[PDB]
């Protein structure tokens, strides 16, 4: 039901977990909340050289 | 010991690997078996001849036996007699059904004078508020869904009701 | 204004999508910019629509149980919602939901003649009913009776 | 130092808060927090008549499905005597013997899915699916509700059903034999759901516990032979039991208990009096005046159906097992149609008082794996 | 003379947006209603039948549905199972700690009223929408299994129906008072311990 | 702790919260402060919510003698959930009027 | 220089061309009845005419395409 | 996953070789044209199998 196939399912998932309201909780901010997945992300991205 | 290990630690593996393997080609014929599950939503079960949907009203079969309430469980409906004089029977003037409090019971249906309380089957509610829930006499009827009166419906028959094997 | 194009001029039409919805909302977003505000309705469960559209008609509440007659004498949803609709408002786009399929009075394609009058006499509705993949539209009124 | 395991309870049986201490990774004590699903029927039990009353029984009561009428039943039918037919008893058996396999799907399935068993929940399901037509076609929408009035039943279930059990009926016979062979296979399977929760049998005995998990010590308190219920007793069986008690004594119990459903169907389809009910409606057309058929035996009804009856003191008691547990529901014997007091007695009630006791010591993992293999459920539990 | 009328629309709603700035936000919605997420809750009388929504009966996991058992995460959450007065306290920390975009529904007839549990007892809770604002309500005691993906259905065409400044009626205020106690502090009473 | 009766438009916060956040979702619960229906199923101007604010005092002050349990909070919550329902049958008070669902607790309006 | 112009666009032009509107259909032509390794073969597919079957994937458009003059 | 199928395969298999060598690809026809754009995709081809 995502058109023929879920081709375009995943993107779809995508974009809709794009806005979903962040919402950092109180305990902990940004001092290490963002902080925290952009190392993993990271850490797999750069692999692929 | 070690030589006990240095015999074992084949053996631990080995049991394991027939393990493994032995699940693995048994859910091969699963993972591409030749079932085929529920189709879209355009291929809805058949359904038999005894169940209960949405309960019907009437104003020539309902003689004013009242017993509407004696038989839903909250003594659902009201009842409303207002001062007749043809011979000792009150009119059938205030009614409402409402699903949203009934919950499908409707045992009248089994002692109703004249097949008054009966059964359908639909479902398209799509209350935006509770308040919206008046079933009156005769657009109960309405000609429902009929499953086998569409033109985009093949229903093949359920395991309870195809032939055997 | 592709809607535009069999609303304004026909103020008589009937939605025939593809039985999910993922199609038809881009259209009513579209409508709200002219004049024209929402009612839904999904028809199914009130009688005949007359009393329903310009008459105060006593809507029997759900009852709980007990009490006999009681009830509250519901009004009717266009004059008043014109009393507070601005006097800068095209029309009432409204839609008869439970238009379909494919003492209540069965909203039978007559009560939807007698539904297109109050577009034209004294609400612009759109009746409802599931159809081809290919979202179309088609006047009831012709398809009434 | 402590935390609630959820009120969300990312489990099987619905809503249960478990409020436990937690050294880093072990646990050392835990508590449960019970009543949050309070179904009142003790209330408005006293407030109905009978068959306004009888859809409620089946409603705090949806995974055993139909263990809940059985008393529902003996109470206006077979306190005062009014003499159910053997014909329609063996239906009634018909019904209870699939009620064991209503439960022992919807515990095993969500056992596997407890244990580490990932795939086969939707397998369960797809094997289910034939159930959920036999209770919708017999006498209700899909739980069968309103299968049992009080002289006889609703109304013997439709030819399209008894001699039709062929199918699923030698279809799960070969079926069983898979999770055997699947739950000797990997071990970790079988390592984990070891050496976990075990209990004795005298403190099984002593705490108060019933069912398969019971029998699973070689206490073989099967009340499925105690009662003259109905005169079901003609039918043979084997009693399933363990010698252990422990979680994968439960699993061996549960699994060797649903062999012997399908073979007291068989029992009955030919034994019945009426046997298949095509027969029975093949046979009331030629002896249409008078015979066995529609006599004391073949009736499904024997007097007129109302909610206009009397009682006398009469406060009897039954001790109704399902493989869930026991059931019971005493009543002071009231001269009122509608009885003074009501009272339910559930399994689930008398399951988690040895709760907080089991997971002694152990980690969440092992919470996890007792809480799943106890086979328990709310809705039975707060009524 | 009538009673209890409805407000005045203050605005005049009179706008026009441009197509490249209104499409991004009609697609974005249309992705948030065609990949929602279920929110795992399930109590009593009407829910068993949602665990056959995801095999060969029933099958909603078909169009993306994902089910979460986590608050924060997920945005589709049904109230299946009448509910009581307890496990509501708890039941609307749920919805207050969800992203903005939850849109909920009801399930089960008992919810939208308490059907069977509606004579005399001090423990449902008549209906839901009284504890939660949620969209659509869902009959049947138990709910219809087909009755449900109907309903989705339904609701799927609601957020298709939103616009780029629709995203703004979610923004909160605060009528947050000032008012103290004076009165005597219990202690607790869930007392963890064996 | 913060356990308060927080149903649909009546939330009896038992902790100080009435900043943007509490910082510990009680701010060691000293104050107990309320918050009036955020989902905005009323709309508010002060003079009429000033009546409701006055009889705070009545049944915060006037008719409280038992320590804080929800017992008290159930007591405040009840005529709380009627103090609205008077200020509306008599039309001082109307509705949400927004892009919601528009729901109707009290079910439509009347005609008196 | 001059004729190299139809062979490189028929080629390419044939791959996005006629895979991406079939993969749709040898798909839902079986999807519960295919072999051990069935599956295997339109799903690498699915990547190498990648050019056009995102062409022929859920973006295929539904504009309202402004009629003939 | 993706990272440590790419590499396991890359290390334990032939990365872009086919079931016969690399090289040997080329030689058995005495002459290559245009096997440029080819071997590219059949290397994305070979590999990501």
């Not at chain 4, 402590?2 to 990774?25: A, C, F, K, Y």
């Not at chain 5, 994902?66 to 708890?90: E, F, H, Y």
Request: aromatic letters at 12%; glycine letters at 6%.
């Amino acid at each position: 039901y995502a058109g023929p196939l879920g081709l375009l399912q995943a993107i779809a998932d995508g974009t809709k977990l794009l806005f979903k309201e962040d919402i950092l909780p109180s305990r902990g901010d940004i001092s290490l909340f963002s902080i925290g997945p952009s190392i993993a992300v990271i850490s797999v991205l750069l692999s692929f050289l | 010991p070690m030589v006990t290990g240095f015999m074992s630690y084949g053996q631990q593996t080995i049991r394991a690997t027939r393990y493994i393997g032995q699940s693995f080609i048994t859910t091969l014929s699963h993972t591409n078996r030749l079932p085929i599950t529920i189709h879209y939503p355009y291929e809805k079960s058949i359904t038999p001849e005894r169940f209960r949907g949405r309960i019907h009203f009437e104003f020539d079969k309902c003689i004013a036996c009242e017993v509407c309430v004696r038989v839903c469980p909250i003594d659902l409906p009201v009842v409303d007699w207002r001062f007749e004089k043809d011979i000792k029977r009150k009119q059938l003037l205030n009614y409402s059904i409402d699903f949203g409090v009934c919950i499908f019971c409707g045992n009248c249906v089994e002692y109703c004078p004249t097949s008054c309380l009966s059964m359908t089957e639909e479902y398209e509610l799509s209350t935006y508020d509770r308040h919206e829930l008046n079933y009156n006499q005769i657009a109960l009827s309405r000609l429902p869904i009929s499953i086998m009166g569409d033109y985009t419906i093949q229903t093949i028959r359920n395991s309870s009701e195809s032939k055997i094997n | 204004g592709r809607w535009l194009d069999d609303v304004e001029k026909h103020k008589a039409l009937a939605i025939y999508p593809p039985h999910e919805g993922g199609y038809e909302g881009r259209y009513l977003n579209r409508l709200r910019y002219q004049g024209y505000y929402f009612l839904d309705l999904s028809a199914r469960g009130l009688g005949d629509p007359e009393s329903t559209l310009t008459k105060i008609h006593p809507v029997c509440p759900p009852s709980l149980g007990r009490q006999p007659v009681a009830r509250w004498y519901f009004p009717p949803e266009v004059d008043y919602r014109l009393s507070l609709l601005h006097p800068d408002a095209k029309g009432l786009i409204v839609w008869v939901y439970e238009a379909k399929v494919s003492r209540l009075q069965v909203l039978s394609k007559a009560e939807l003649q007698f539904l297109a009058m109050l577009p034209d006499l004294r609400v612009r509705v759109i009746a409802e009913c599931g159809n081809w993949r290919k979202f179309i539209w088609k006047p009831l009124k012709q398809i009434s009776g | 130092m402590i935390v609630n395991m959820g009120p969300q309870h990312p489990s099987m049986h619905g809503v249960l808060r478990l409020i436990v201490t937690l050294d880093g990774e072990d646990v050392i004590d835990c508590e449960p927090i019970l009543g949050y699903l309070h179904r009142g029927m003790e209330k408005i039990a006293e407030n109905r008549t009978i068959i306004q009353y009888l859809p409620y029984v089946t409603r705090w009561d949806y995974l055993a499905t139909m263990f809940t009428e059985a008393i529902t039943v003996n109470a206006p039918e077979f306190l005062e005597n009014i003499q159910i037919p053997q014909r329609a008893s063996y239906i009634r058996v018909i019904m209870l013997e699939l009620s064991r396999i209503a439960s022992h799907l919807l515990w095993l399935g969500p056992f596997m899915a407890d244990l580490g068993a990932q795939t086969p929940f939707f397998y369960i399901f797809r094997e289910r699916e034939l159930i959920y037509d036999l209770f919708e076609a017999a006498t209700g929408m899909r739980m069968m509700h309103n299968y049992f009035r009080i002289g006889g039943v609703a109304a013997d279930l439709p030819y399209g059903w008894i001699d039709k059990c062929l199918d699923f009926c030698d279809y799960f016979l070969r079926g069983v034999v898979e999770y055997q062979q699947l739950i000797t296979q990997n071990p970790i399977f079988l390592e984990r759901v070891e050496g976990v929760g075990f209990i004795s049998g005298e403190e099984a005995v002593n705490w108060g516990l019933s069912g398969p998990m019971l029998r699973a010590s070689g206490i073989q308190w099967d009340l499925r032979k105690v009662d003259p219920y109905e005169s079901y007793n003609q039918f043979d069986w084997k009693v399933q039991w363990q010698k252990e008690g422990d979680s994968l004594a439960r699993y061996l119990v549960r699994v060797g208990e649903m062999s012997e459903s399908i073979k007291i169907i068989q029992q009955a389809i030919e034994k019945i009096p009426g046997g298949p009910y095509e027969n029975l409606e093949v046979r009331r057309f030629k002896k249409e005046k008078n015979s066995e058929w529609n006599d004391f035996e073949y009736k499904f009804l024997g007097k007129k159906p109302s909610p206009n009856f009397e009682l006398s003191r009469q406060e009897l008691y039954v001790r109704v097992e399902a493989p869930k547990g026991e059931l019971g529901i005493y009543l002071v014997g009231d001269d009122s149609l509608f009885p003074w007091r009501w009272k339910i007695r559930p399994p689930g009630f008398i399951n988690l008082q040895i709760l907080p006791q089991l997971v002694k010591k152990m980690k969440l993992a092992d919470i996890m794996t007792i809480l799943g293999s106890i086979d328990i459920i709310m809705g039975e539990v707060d009524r | 003379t009538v009673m209890n009328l409805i407000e005045f629309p203050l605005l005049d709603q009179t706008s026009s947006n441009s197509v490249i700035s209104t499409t991004l936000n009609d697609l974005s919605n249309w992705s948030r209603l065609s990949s929602l997420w279920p929110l795992l809750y399930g109590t009593s009388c009407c829910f068993i039948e949602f665990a056959s929504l995801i095999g060969s009966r029933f099958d909603f996991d078909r169009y993306g549905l994902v089910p979460r058992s986590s608050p924060r995460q997920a945005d589709l959450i049904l109230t299946a199972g009448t509910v009581t007065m307890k496990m509501a306290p708890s039941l609307v920390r749920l919805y207050e700690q969800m992203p903005e975009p939850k849109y909920v529904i009801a399930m089960g007839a008992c919810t939208i009223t308490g059907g069977m549990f509606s004579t005399d007892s001090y423990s449902t809770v008549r209906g839901v929408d009284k504890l939660i604002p949620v969209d659509v309500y869902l009959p049947g005691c138990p709910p219809k299994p087909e009755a449900v993906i109907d309903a989705l259905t339904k609701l799927r065409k609601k957020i298709s129906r939103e616009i780029v400044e629709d995203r703004t009626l979610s923004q909160n205020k605060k009528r947050c008072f000032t008012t103290s106690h004076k009165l005597y502090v219990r202690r607790s009473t869930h007392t963890g311990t064996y | 702790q913060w356990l308060s009766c927080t149903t649909r438009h009546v939330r009896i916060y038992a902790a100080y919260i009435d900043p943007e956040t509490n910082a510990f979702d009680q701010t060691q619960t000293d104050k107990l402060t309320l918050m009036l229906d955020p989902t905005e199923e009323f709309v508010w101007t002060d003079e009429t919510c000033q009546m409701v604010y006055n009889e705070f005092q009545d049944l915060v002050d006037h008719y409280e003698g038992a320590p804080l349990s929800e017992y008290t909070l159930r007591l405040i919550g009840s005529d709380l959930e009627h103090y609205i329902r008077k200020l509306l049958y008599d039309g001082e008070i109307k509705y949400n009027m927004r892009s919601r669902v528009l729901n109707f607790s009290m079910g439509k309006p009347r005609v008196k | 220089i001059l004729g190299i112009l139809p062979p490189v666009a028929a080629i390419a032009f044939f791959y996005l061309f006629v895979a991406p509107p079939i993969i749709m259909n040898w798909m839902r032509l079986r999807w519960f009845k295919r072999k051990f390794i069935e599956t295997y073969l339109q799903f690498m597919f699915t990547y190498l005419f990648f050019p056009g079957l995102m062409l022929w994937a859920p973006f295929v458009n539904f504009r309202k395409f402004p009629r003939d003059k | 996953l993706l990272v440590s199928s790419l590499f396991v395969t890359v290390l334990y298999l032939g990365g872009w070789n086919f079931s016969i060598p690399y090289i040997s690809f080329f030689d058995f026809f005495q002459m290559n044209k245009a096997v440029g754009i080819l071997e590219m995709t059949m290397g994305i081809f070979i590999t990501l199998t």
